[PDB]
Ligand SMILES: CNC(=O)c1cnc(C)s1
């Protein structure tokens with residue numbers, strides 16, 4: 541589990557979105573495994589705007605932050621997990637690292653701020669849904 545809290549927005553894995561998230565929907569994309577909802581209090585995270593390929597991600601299934609190199613966002617075939625089938629997912633970044641289903645929501649961060657959240661994994665590759673293209677998260 542986990543979210544990004546940027547201004548009055550809440551960024552979560554679409555598959556982990558709550559009823560309240562869907563009842564306060566700003567934007568959602570199944571292909572990206574992303575859903576954004578409204579908040580009342582302002583959030584403490586800042587979004588990276590950058591093409592960084594190095595950063596650090598939180599891995600709840602290890603209680604550890606790991607430094608990783610990661611691929612630029614792209615359309616990758618993801619095998620089946622507990623929450624999705626063997627399908628394709630867009631705006632995905634992969635690193636070599638440990639990931640389990642409950643690690644989804646863990647932040648990936650670079651020197652510029654939050655890059656993305658754990659979304660996919662399999663055979664020692666953790667996948668992150670990118671948010672750095674969501675400029676609209678910075679305004680209104
Ligand atoms: C977010 N990571 C995962 O849910 C997975 C890692 N390995 C799998 C077979 S599913």
Ligand SMILES: [Zn+2]
Nearest residue numbers: 590592650652
């Ligand atoms: Zn960066």
